[PDB]
Design a protein around this ligand. Structure first.
Ligand SMILES: *[C@@H]1O[C@H](CO)[C@@H](O[C@@H]2O[C@H](CO)[C@@H](O)[C@H](O)[C@H]2NC(C)=O)[C@H](O)[C@H]1NC(C)=O
Ligand SMILES: *[C@@H]1O[C@H](CO)[C@@H](O[C@@H]2O[C@H](CO)[C@@H](O)[C@H](O)[C@H]2NC(C)=O)[C@H](O)[C@H]1NC(C)=O
Ligand SMILES: *[C@@H]1O[C@H](CO)[C@@H](O[C@@H]2O[C@H](CO)[C@@H](O)[C@H](O)[C@H]2NC(C)=O)[C@H](O)[C@H]1NC(C)=O
Ligand SMILES: *[C@@H]1O[C@H](CO)[C@@H](O)[C@H](O)[C@H]1NC(C)=O
Ligand SMILES: *[C@@H]1O[C@H](CO)[C@@H](O)[C@H](O)[C@H]1NC(C)=O
Ligand SMILES: *[C@@H]1O[C@H](CO)[C@@H](O)[C@H](O)[C@H]1NC(C)=O
Ligand SMILES: *[C@H]1O[C@H](CO)[C@@H](O)[C@H](O)[C@H]1NC(C)=O
Ligand SMILES: *[C@H]1O[C@H](CO)[C@@H](O)[C@H](O)[C@H]1NC(C)=O
Lengths: 483, 482, 482
């Protein structure tokens, strides 16, 4: 007659790693890391991204006339700019603080386009001839739809021109202007006139006054001229005054805007936009998961799991799987017993110790999930060629946190896996010892997990062991004789 | 006759969490997190903060004439600027590199105000008419006390004016100037004259040259004109030359200054300043604590504990409290209860109790030691055209806060489990040392206790507690009882 | 007749710390921290550093004529600038975006110097008199070799001058120019002429247009004038046009360059450059190590271990050294000592010893693996008006240093405790496997050892070591002894 102590086994081939041992097969486990994504852009909080098509952010927002599909009021959860977009700043020059403009635009939610200064505002000049072969529309010469290239009437001198606009709404207004710099005095004279020329812009809180910086430069997009483009934000209540006697590229249309309550982004990607929804939308695709880590992309909007470099984060929940060892036959629970007597034989799990282990492991998993429920958020702000130091500072920082979090996740998994599997060993040992202490020398150890009884142990003697009430003196005499 | 093994219990209702289970009552514990603060500003290393009252940093340092309460030499451990302060830049315009000025000012310790360029410096011009209704003093038109608004004499043209000052001391000098921009050419002509006009400032190591940017703008504080305000630092030994033919807002008074040996700050707060001292002074109050973490504020000066988001960080030191345990023990953590003809009673095991005390004390101190650094957030400001670096600073500050909060919270959960396990193992060790000695001269009982198969006197029992029992002495007597 | 269970000891005096106790002597250990370096600068990936000697980066790259040792084509893995270097910007003035130039230069690996605009490009002007006593060569007045200081011929007016250059190669070109600002109108007229004067530079992607900002400034290096120096990069395909009627300091020679595929650096150090190679080269010396941590310097190029503040990171691999343990074992970590009629001796248990070796080895390697990443501090410079970003870079660098130092030091304390506990458990397991087998045909002794109640030959003893003993064979012979 005998009783054994053992633990669950099954057909699982899933492995985990621990601090002491690699490739350890276990009976149950949980993958904390999400590796899958749909390669496309979906709506976030039911709001669609804005696809810039063949236009850059600058082409869109300045109104490059190849970008008419985008013209007007828009709203978006994020922006998708195609890497090979060809329609941007078509008449050559520089946009001042371009990178800060993009950061502004990535924080915006909705825009309403409106005519800020109609052509009629500018008297004694030609407002209908400011076009260039650099900015074509259907083969023809054209120009930015948000800017007005004013020139002199051929017969007449360029009049002093003035315009004013007041922001009487509760929304800020994003607007644009520029200063044109011809390549030589002949062209200056033709378009504006000789002498001192100025472009002046004034607000309660910004002042601007500049002139042509004439110089012959190599042609870009077929032009030897250049424009310095500027942008600004006219705050609620503020008023703008414009004066010029030449070289003004005037604001024409502008944008009343709202700032998002949510983090937005400009993604530079060729991925398709489709009719779908995502809780989590990364730069390289949408993720639908309830896992807490993710190795898809560090750049996203919505609610995403923490990004890490790991390929897997497999957390052991069950036991070492060692069949012949463990008992494939148990099935009821994690730890338990196998008995053999005259009434028969069989397996039966110990409910108490099994549940305690379930409760602890469950709590461990949830605690890890809970404590890992924050994300470091990388951002795709841009930096100019004269901003290498801050660009490098941003990169080292983002890689810095990535390395810390990847380390924290991987190390924790290795260490707690070892603990979890040790806890199981200890739980099994505990049951075996409780049986040991009870039977004393009315049974033989066998160094096996099992005990050979020195007496007959019926189905009530055996259940007397499972509830921990055995009674040694009852079989003491019977046992001592067999020797 | 019997001997038992047990562990301490008490009346404690303090709970801790562990990785495996929550709300576990324990006998002793230590809160690592400080949550309390006095809602005020105190002295730090015995130096008081400077209260700017109804002035902004800029109103103060430019010498807005409503800020005379601050005028002159001052010294401070930190600066307190009130959120509603009304006296700042009164004549409209921008201070260039305003945010970098503030960072500088937060790093300064003491200033001494002095006349850098007296009015007599500027010949052939009017130095006594440069006042405005935008900057009022006692119902009158006035102007910044540290700047001089020079205009042309009506009858005469604005002479080329020159002035020079040499820093012959060992302290750097913080000084200010500006360029005035009238709204139109009429005003430009009246005050300065037409033609190209410049303001040029030169040092051994910096040059500045700028002109009027004339533009008709909406009024601000009743003025259509603007000033671009500038600041700079004249180093020891250096000389400043000033040259202008118009539009100059000249430095008048300036500040010799010392840089602090300590970290300083500008706090934007309404909290009161009081007669008190603080080792640790945060933006939302003073902390007096020997704890190593703190959830009050990430911004401070002095020596403060590490900031974390946690509401609590309770580290178990004692045992699971299950009164099970013996409320009767009291002497120590682990021990014995005996019963014989001479009587009964509890007595702690000194050796194993002290070893546990030493380990737990060492663990606490080790954690304290390794957590004795702080990440320091700063309240530097960023302009509207510095959103990228501002966001970079924010993500970084939140980034370290999240790593430290994680490290602290997880460590507490994990070590709480280990600490309570260690206690279990220690109790079992004692019980086994007794088992091994008595063999079959006592019965286990599966109880923690042992029923002796013989009589065990107060010397037999103390023979167990020191680990020298002698089995053969009672071997016969024990085997007879069956 | 007896059998004992014990563990290895030796003469080791090496100590480690754990979370529960300090200064614990152990039998084997490994130091994870590298503290040694060679105090010199070596080649990295086969390429030598460039030693700037008595020149600053700027003196070199502008071609200060006292820097002819450096003149022409050069290549380097990193740059070494000496702290007391004197030959820099000799004619006083400011280099615009100087700090960003240095970052660029640190990222470059080869340059080829070439004449971009020969003197003949500028007609109707004096190209052979642009020298100053501020920039001496062999006692004589001279000038930067990469710039050309053009002045008017005395008899003639300064002609409009033009030049153009097109980059027809695949490499970018780094070039320089400047605008001269004389101290007064007399000198302006003498050198260039009166009236409006301009310096215009144009590319497909950049435009520049500026004039003299005339002002009398204190003399620096004997000069009241100044030059604003500029730099830029002409990309492959681009063409540069230059137009001026005065005040132009023209590019003369420039540098075609390649960008390194590897991180480079400018080290400010007096350490000697020698004939050696380093995998890892830090600012304070070369490191050759296989260790994973390092407390030498946070600034480096090449492949270096992670920087931390620690003085030591000693990881226990072996046992607590208590000679207790058996100095006599030597064969392994855990094992047996037997005594019978055939003799006596020690013998390690191979199975349990190997399992422990495998786990500890795996632990060490896992730690090494997970610590195989480095945060890299950089020595970019920041101007006086960049205190905020400079402080941001510093707090960030110190932030990660503190996190990694903590992670390393805490991990070592915690795993040391686990490692030493694992050994205790392994020994106990063996002792119990022998207890269970012999039952009461041996006496425990409470000692680690077992006195056999019978004769146990060299086959009886090996019958214990493989776990197959057979109690009934000797059971009777036991019960006799009573
Ligand atoms: C995130 O990790 C997964 C694997 O755990 C990576 O996906 C595997 O990539 C390899 C090589 O690219 C393929 O052969 C496997 O079939 C992929 N596995 C799965 C589940 O897709 C994935 O590359 C990781 N993401 C990134 C950006 O590296
Ligand atoms: C400061 O912390 C120390 C330990 O970090 C605390 O010291 C204990 O304080 C109580 C009395 O308040 C004593 O009974 C203990 O004996 C002290 N422990 C040790 C190890 O010395 C102290 O309480 C803390 N101070 C405050 C104000 O909370
Ligand atoms: C890194 O730590 C090492 C070793 O702990 C330091 O080198 C020791 O310096 C101390 C104090 O000057 C001396 O007791 C020993 O002579 C040194 N020991 C060894 C092994 O070198 C070293 O200073 C540290 N490095 C830095 C940059 O602080
Ligand atoms: C609980 O008991 C002791 C004395 O029996 C007492 O001194 C102690 O203060 C009590 N608990 C608390 C929280 O005060
Ligand atoms: C633990 O106790 C707190 C109150 O002290 C309670 O809010 C919480 O629900 C409890 N949690 C569990 C799991 O018992
Ligand atoms: C921690 O500080 C917060 C301030 O954020 C405070 O409101 C809270 O009460 C603190 N935690 C506890 C347990 O008091
Ligand atoms: C996964 O689903 C559970 C529902 O029990 C939810 O509470 C948890 O937050 C989900 N995961 C994530 C990452 O939000
Ligand atoms: C251990 O402790 C003492 C101070 O308590 C110290 O002086 C000694 O040098 C330490 N030993 C080692 C090896 O660190």
């Amino acid at each position: 007659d005998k009783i054994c102590i053992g633990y669950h086994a099954n057909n699982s081939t899933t492995q985990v790693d621990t601090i002491l041992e690699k490739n350890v097969t276990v009976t149950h486990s949980v993958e904390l890391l999400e590796t899958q994504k749909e390669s496309r852009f979906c709506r976030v909080l039911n709001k669609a991204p804005l696809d810039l098509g063949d236009c850059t952010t600058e082409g869109w927002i300045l109104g490059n006339p190849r970008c008419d599909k985008l013209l007007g009021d828009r709203s978006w959860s994020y922006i998708v700019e195609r890497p090979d977009a060809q329609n941007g700043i078509c008449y050559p020059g520089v946009l001042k603080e371009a990178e800060e403009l993009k950061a502004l635009i990535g924080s915006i939610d909705t825009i309403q386009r409106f005519e800020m200064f109609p052509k009629s505002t500018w008297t004694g000049v030609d407002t209908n001839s400011g076009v260039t072969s650099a900015c074509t529309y259907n083969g023809g010469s054209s120009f930015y739809r948000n800017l007005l290239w004013i020139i002199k009437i051929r017969s007449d001198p360029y009049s002093l021109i003035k315009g004013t606009y007041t922001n009487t709404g509760s929304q800020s207004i994003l607007y644009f202007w520029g200063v044109h710099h011809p390549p030589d005095d002949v062209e200056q004279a033709n378009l504006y006139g000789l002498g001192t020329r100025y472009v002046r812009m004034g607000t309660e809180s910004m002042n601007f006054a500049k002139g042509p910086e004439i110089a012959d430069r190599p042609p870009a997009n077929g032009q030897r001229g250049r424009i310095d483009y500027y942008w600004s934000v006219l705050k609620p209540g503020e008023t703008l005054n414009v004066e010029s006697n030449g070289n003004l590229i005037a604001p024409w249309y502008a944008y009343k805007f709202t700032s998002s309550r949510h983090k937005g982004a400009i993604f530079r990607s060729d991925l398709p936009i489709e009719n779908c929804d995502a809780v989590c939308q990364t730069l390289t695709g949408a993720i639908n998961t309830n896992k807490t880590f993710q190795n898809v992309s560090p750049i996203w909007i919505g609610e995403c799991p923490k990004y890490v470099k790991s390929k897997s984060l497999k957390l052991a929940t069950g036991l070492r799987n060692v069949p012949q060892g463990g008992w494939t036959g148990m099935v009821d629970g994690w730890y338990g017993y196998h008995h053999e007597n005259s009434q028969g034989s069989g397996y039966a799990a110990d409910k108490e110790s099994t549940q305690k282990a379930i409760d602890g492991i469950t709590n461990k998993v949830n605690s890890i999930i809970d404590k890992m429920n924050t994300q470091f958020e990388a951002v795709e702000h841009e930096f100019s060629n004269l901003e290498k130091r801050i660009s490098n500072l941003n990169k080292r920082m983002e890689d810095g946190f990535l390395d810390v979090w990847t380390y924290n996740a991987e190390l924790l998994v290795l260490l707690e896996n070892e603990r979890t599997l040790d806890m199981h060993d200890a739980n099994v040992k505990n049951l075996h010892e409780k049986v040991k202490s009870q039977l004393r020398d009315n049974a033989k150890d066998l160094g096996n997990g099992c005990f050979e009884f020195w007496h007959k142990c019926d189905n009530e003697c055996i259940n007397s062991v499972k509830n921990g009430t055995y009674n040694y003196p009852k079989y003491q005499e019977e046992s001592r004789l067999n020797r």
